[PDB]
Design a protein around this motif. Structure first.
Motif, PDB file in Angstrom:
ATOM      1  N   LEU A 115     -20.045  26.127 -27.948  1.00 15.57           N
ATOM      2  CA  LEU A 115     -21.472  26.505 -27.754  1.00 15.57           C
ATOM      3  C   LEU A 115     -22.302  25.260 -27.432  1.00 15.57           C
ATOM      4  O   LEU A 115     -23.255  25.384 -26.638  1.00 15.57           O
ATOM      5  CB  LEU A 115     -21.984  27.166 -29.038  1.00 15.57           C
ATOM      6  CG  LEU A 115     -21.184  28.373 -29.521  1.00 15.57           C
ATOM      7  CD1 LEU A 115     -21.749  28.909 -30.828  1.00 15.57           C
ATOM      8  CD2 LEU A 115     -21.172  29.463 -28.465  1.00 15.57           C
ATOM      9  N   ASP A 116     -21.970  24.115 -28.033  1.00 12.92           N
ATOM     10  CA  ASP A 116     -22.806  22.892 -27.879  1.00 12.92           C
ATOM     11  C   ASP A 116     -22.911  22.418 -26.424  1.00 12.92           C
ATOM     12  O   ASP A 116     -24.022  22.006 -26.039  1.00 12.92           O
ATOM     13  CB  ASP A 116     -22.289  21.761 -28.771  1.00 12.92           C
ATOM     14  CG  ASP A 116     -22.262  22.115 -30.248  1.00 12.92           C
ATOM     15  OD1 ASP A 116     -22.816  23.173 -30.608  1.00 12.92           O
ATOM     16  OD2 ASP A 116     -21.685  21.331 -31.026  1.00 12.92           O
ATOM     17  N   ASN A 117     -21.822  22.451 -25.646  1.00 13.97           N
ATOM     18  CA  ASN A 117     -21.881  21.846 -24.282  1.00 13.97           C
ATOM     19  C   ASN A 117     -21.443  22.802 -23.167  1.00 13.97           C
ATOM     20  O   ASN A 117     -20.879  23.860 -23.489  1.00 13.97           O
ATOM     21  CB  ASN A 117     -21.096  20.532 -24.214  1.00 13.97           C
ATOM     22  CG  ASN A 117     -19.659  20.651 -24.682  1.00 13.97           C
ATOM     23  OD1 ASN A 117     -19.168  21.745 -24.952  1.00 13.97           O
ATOM     24  ND2 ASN A 117     -18.974  19.524 -24.783  1.00 13.97           N
ATOM     25  N   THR A 118     -21.728  22.443 -21.907  1.00 11.84           N
ATOM     26  CA  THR A 118     -21.303  23.250 -20.726  1.00 11.84           C
ATOM     27  C   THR A 118     -19.848  22.906 -20.370  1.00 11.84           C
ATOM     28  O   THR A 118     -19.373  21.852 -20.831  1.00 11.84           O
ATOM     29  CB  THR A 118     -22.255  23.004 -19.546  1.00 11.84           C
ATOM     30  OG1 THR A 118     -22.204  21.615 -19.220  1.00 11.84           O
ATOM     31  CG2 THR A 118     -23.681  23.411 -19.842  1.00 11.84           C
ATOM     32  N   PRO A 119     -19.103  23.711 -19.561  1.00  8.96           N
ATOM     33  CA  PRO A 119     -17.731  23.358 -19.205  1.00  8.96           C
ATOM     34  C   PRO A 119     -17.608  22.288 -18.109  1.00  8.96           C
ATOM     35  O   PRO A 119     -18.622  21.876 -17.574  1.00  8.96           O
ATOM     36  CB  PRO A 119     -17.122  24.679 -18.712  1.00  8.96           C
ATOM     37  CG  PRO A 119     -18.287  25.395 -18.080  1.00  8.96           C
ATOM     38  CD  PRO A 119     -19.470  25.010 -18.943  1.00  8.96           C
ATOM     39  N   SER A 120     -16.375  21.876 -17.804  1.00  8.15           N
ATOM     40  CA  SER A 120     -16.121  20.841 -16.770  1.00  8.15           C
ATOM     41  C   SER A 120     -15.932  21.524 -15.416  1.00  8.15           C
ATOM     42  O   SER A 120     -15.717  22.748 -15.397  1.00  8.15           O
ATOM     43  CB  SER A 120     -14.907  20.040 -17.127  1.00  8.15           C
ATOM     44  OG  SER A 120     -13.778  20.886 -17.294  1.00  8.15           O
TER      45      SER A 120
END
Lengths: 218, 231, 97, 231
Positions: free
Chosen positions: D113-118
């Motif tokens: 939830l904390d960050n967007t994907p690569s």
């Protein structure tokens, strides 16, 4: 009225000399058709880049007896055969080979003591003109000779004695006459200044521009 | 006065009276890719007091240059006209003459009579190959005979004006424009395997200048293929 | 071009569109949008730019001058809006202090 | 019966009644390079008894493929329609259903939830990225949430038919053809920076076959860009 390319390039010019014997080491003649051997005609044709023409081959076959020590020689009339090989045609490896019977090669039979035999050849080039000067490599991927396009191929000529005349040896000669007919030319270019070296290419030795004089005011 | 000519995205600056000399009375036409019709400006070559000459092969000259190089690569055969512009900018205190000429099918002689020359020595890519004054040595080398008074083809350099030419005299003229039609026996030919035309530039009357002038005159050559079609 | 009348030469004015970076060599600048400017004939060149890109100038040829004429010259460049020009959302200038 | 459709040099074989479903009642048109209008046939993906799904990003799917890849490279911005064909050849003793759907602006959730994907995990180039049945672990990884009953976007997979879709039932149907108009807020957008549409294929009713049949069904996807223009 006289300097047209027709009247300038329609002269019968001898282009070959050779000899074949009824019996002996050489028994047949062979010469790939080319207008490069005769310098007089080669230098006249090298005025233009692209040239197209028809031919009128006329031969002159003469026979002479040889210094032999066989006796009771009785000669019979001699008959000569001249087989014209179209480009890509089979070429006789020997004199009594089977290729002398292919109905494709148009051979003309001649008996000594008549009017010399003559035949004509049309424009055989797959391309639209014979090219005197090619500026490339014949092979598509290169690694091929420079300036040697196969589009100018005009076939080969073979000649032999159909019947040996007498037990005694006979040696005959044949002079091939070249006569371009219905000539056309394109892209005029300057006359060759230096003398020819090899009929294969345009290689030459550097030469002066002209004959020198004493002083400029003379 | 000056004028601007635009082809695609490139632009050239030329005089009002350019004095164009058409090839053989014929303007390049399609046989009966527009994106290849631009001014491919090659490099400049410094003309000096001793420079013998230069020569370019138009198909090869544009073998590495962008769209023309990419097209002549995958595509098999094709045909192409040309519009060579030779611009030579020099002062009023300079003097000299140039013979700008496009020679079709210029077959070049080899220094060793026995064999033909090599491809690298004959074709100068992205640069201009140059002649020489003294005769080339005849050893065991596949070099090209680069004598300038014979031009390499083997003929006296004087009568090289039979071909579509134009004279640049730094006294009156400043540039030459030669339109060249597609000349070949075959309707279409592989551009890489065979070169149809050679551009030759020869300084008959040498450059000369007083001390304290520019040491060289930068000739500039611009090629623009007209009516290029492929199969 | 603000140089002596005798001074002559050529320049390559090439404009690379936004996505592409500035060209490195002269050939790469030629293969894009370019204008070969000849100072000997025309003394002032105008470039109209659509739609940021880059503007690069190269020496097609060195300056050629007869004796008694200086070879070090200078070039000046004017900028101006052209054709359609609209401005929206008035804000404060950042040059005040 | 069968029929042949030709675009440029490629050709496709389809039935007489193809049952095309236009995007939103609109056929792709120019905004008011033809050489890019061909059938870019991608790879086949074996559909098995346990395969969760697959998904392609149309702009990325054709990033390495020839002319389209070269064009979207130098050119800045542009727009492009699409005509995705999904052909699924299976016997009469096989059974199963597929949901072929083109989802515009499909933003995908990240497992953490904390960050967007690569970028690599989100975009599959020249291959098809596939979903998963079980939930993706939530650690310190920039992975994409590949749960199939949520489709990744975060919405219940059932109502994914609001988007232009089409059902392939191996009982009656065999293929689907979806025309997609250029949908974007901006008139033209950089194809590399932003992907406008995502093609999703989901097997609702699983494949099933008796022992002694082909172990897999080779789905085949063909893209054909319609009315592509650049700036």
């Amino acid at each position: 009225s006289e300097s047209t390319i027709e009247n300038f390039l329609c002269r019968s010019a001898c282009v070959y000399f050779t000899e074949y014997e009824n019996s002996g080491a050489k028994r047949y003649a062979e010469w790939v058709l080319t207008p490069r051997q005769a310098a007089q005609l080669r230098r006249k044709l090298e005025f233009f880049t692209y040239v197209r023409f028809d031919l009128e081959l006329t031969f002159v076959i003469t026979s002479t007896q040889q210094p032999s020590t066989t006796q009771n020689q009785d000669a019979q009339i001699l008959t000569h055969q001249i087989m014209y090989v179209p480009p890509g045609g089979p070429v006789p490896d020997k004199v009594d080979s089977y290729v002398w019977q292919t109905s494709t090669n148009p051979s003309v039979f001649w008996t000594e003591g008549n009017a010399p035999p003559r035949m004509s050849i049309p424009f055989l080039s797959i391309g639209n003109a014979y090219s005197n000067f090619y500026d490339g490599w014949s092979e598509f991927s290169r690694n091929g000779v420079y300036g040697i396009n196969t589009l100018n191929n005009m076939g080969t000529l073979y000649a032999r004695h159909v019947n040996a005349g007498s037990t005694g040896p006979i040696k005959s000669t044949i002079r091939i006459y070249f006569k371009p007919k219905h000539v056309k030319a394109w892209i005029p270019r300057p006359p060759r200044l230096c003398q020819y070296e090899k009929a294969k290419n345009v290689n030459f030795q550097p030469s002066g521009v002209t004959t020198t004089r004493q002083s400029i005011t003379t | 006065r000056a004028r601007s000519i635009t082809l695609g995205n490139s632009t050239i600056t030329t005089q009002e009276c350019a004095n164009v000399v058409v090839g053989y009375g014929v303007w390049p036409d399609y046989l009966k890719d527009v994106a290849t019709c631009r001014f491919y400006t090659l490099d400049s070559v410094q003309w000096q007091k001793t420079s013998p000459g230069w020569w370019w092969k138009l198909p090869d000259a544009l073998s590495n240059l962008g769209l023309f190089g990419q097209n002549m690569q995958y595509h098999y055969l094709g045909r192409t006209g040309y519009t060579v512009h030779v611009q030579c900018n020099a002062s009023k205190f300079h003097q000299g003459c140039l013979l700008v000429v496009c020679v079709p099918e210029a077959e070049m002689g080899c220094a060793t009579l026995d064999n033909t020359p090599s491809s690298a020595e004959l074709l100068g890519g992205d640069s201009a190959k140059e002649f020489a004054d003294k005769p080339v040595a005849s050893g065991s080398n596949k070099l090209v005979q680069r004598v300038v008074y014979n031009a390499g083809m083997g003929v006296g350099v004087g009568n090289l004006t039979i071909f579509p030419h134009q004279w640049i005299n730094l006294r009156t003229n400043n540039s030459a424009t030669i339109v060249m039609p597609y000349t070949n026996s075959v309707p279409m030919d592989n551009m890489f395997r065979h070169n149809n035309v050679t551009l030759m530039v020869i300084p008959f009357v040498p450059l000369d200048y007083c001390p304290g002038s520019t040491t060289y005159v930068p000739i500039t050559v611009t090629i623009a293929p007209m009516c290029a079609e492929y199969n | 071009f603000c140089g002596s009348a005798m001074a002559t030469g050529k320049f390559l004015l090439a404009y690379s569109p936004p996505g592409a970076g500035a060209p490195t060599k002269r050939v790469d600048a030629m293969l894009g949008t370019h204008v070969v400017w000849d100072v000997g004939l025309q003394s002032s060149c105008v470039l109209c730019i659509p739609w940021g890109g880059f503007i690069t100038c190269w020496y097609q040829t060195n300056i050629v001058v007869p004796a008694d004429a200086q070879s070090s010259c200078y070039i000046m460049c004017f900028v101006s809006a052209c054709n359609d020009f609209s401005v929206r959302l008035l804000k404060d200038t950042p040059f005040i202090s």
